[PDB]
Write a protein that binds this ligand. Structure first.
Ligand SMILES: *[C@@H]1O[C@H](CO)[C@@H](O)[C@H](O)[C@H]1NC(C)=O
Ligand SMILES: [Mg+2]
Length: 208
C-alpha cells in the first residue's frame, strides 16, 4: 500500500495527477479497467507541469516506499502538438516503456525496488521534444498466484520535455490493452516453485 505522489522536488499531486488511492494507498486489480492507465476513474489534470530535458533523469517518489515484491516499470506518452497536456489523457496505443527492473534469482526472489522511495527514471535522449505523461507502476506479486491477484500501484506525471531528437518509439501500447490477467509476469506464484526467470508484462523497454 503506497502512492506515487511526487516527482523531483514537487509536492504531493502537484505535477502528478491525483490518483484515486491518494487517501487509502489502495491498488488497481483489474487490468481492463480505465484505472490501469493513471489510477483515475475520471481523468483530472495536475495543477503543474515538470520541465525536464531529453536525456535527463526524473525522480519519481513512492510513499511511504515500495515494500511488496514485484517489478517497477515506467512508461511515457507524447501529447500531440495541437493538444493541451491538461486535457490529454493518453487514449489509444500511445504508450512506450522507458524503464523496467528485474528480480535476482535464488532460493527466494529479490527485487531491486524493495524499501526504496526514490526512483531514477531515464528520459530517453532521442525522443521528440514536447509534452508527455509519465506513468509510474509497481506490481505487487505477493498474492498474484490467482487471477486478478496482482496489485498495481500507479500514477501519472505531467512533463514538458525539451532538447529531444526525432526517434519515434515503435509498437506503442494502450492502457487498458497492454496487459492480460494471465500474463506470466502478472499471474504468478513467486514463492513456489521459486521462478528462475521473470517475464515483465508489456512491451520491450524503448532504447535509443
Ligand atoms: C517550464 O517551462 C514553461 C514553458 O513551457 C515555462 O513557462 C515555465 O516558466 C517553466 N517552469 C519552470 C518551473 O521552470
Ligand atoms: Mg499493500
Amino acid at each position: 500500500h503506497y502512492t506515487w505522489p511526487r516527482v523531483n522536488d514537487g509536492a504531493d499531486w502537484q505535477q502528478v495527477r491525483k490518483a484515486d488511492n491518494w487517501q487509502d494507498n489502495g491498488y488497481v486489480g483489474d487490468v481492463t479497467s480505465p484505472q490501469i492507465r493513471c489510477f483515475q476513474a475520471t481523468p483530472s489534470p495536475a495543477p503543474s507541469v515538470l520541465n525536464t530535458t531529453a536525456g535527463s533523469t526524473v525522480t519519481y517518489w513512492a510513499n511511504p516506499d515500495v515494500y511488496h515484491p514485484g517489478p517497477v516499470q515506467f512508461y511515457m506518452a507524447r501529447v500531440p502538438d495541437g493538444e493541451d497536456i491538461n486535457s490529454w489523457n493518453g487514449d489509444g496505443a500511445v504508450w512506450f516503456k522507458v524503464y523496467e527492473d528485474h528480480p535476482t534469482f535464488g532460493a527466494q526472489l529479490t527485487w531491486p525496488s524493495t524499501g526504496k522511495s526514490s526512483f531514477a527514471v531515464p528520459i530517453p535522449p532521442c525522443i521528440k521534444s514536447g509534452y508527455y505523461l509519465l506513468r509510474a507502476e509497481q506490481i505487487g506479486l505477493h498474492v498474484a498466484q490467482s487471477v486478478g491477484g496482482a496489485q498495481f500501484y500507479i500514477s501519472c506525471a505531467q512533463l514538458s520535455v525539451t532538447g529531444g531528437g526525432s526517434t519515434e518509439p515503435p509498437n506503442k501500447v494502450a492502457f487498458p490493452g497492454a496487459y492480460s490477467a494471465t500474463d506470466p509476469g502478472i499471474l504468478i506464484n513467486i514463492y513456489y516453485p521459486v521462478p528462475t526467470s521473470y517475464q515483465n508484462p508489456g512491451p520491450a523497454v524503448f532504447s535509443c
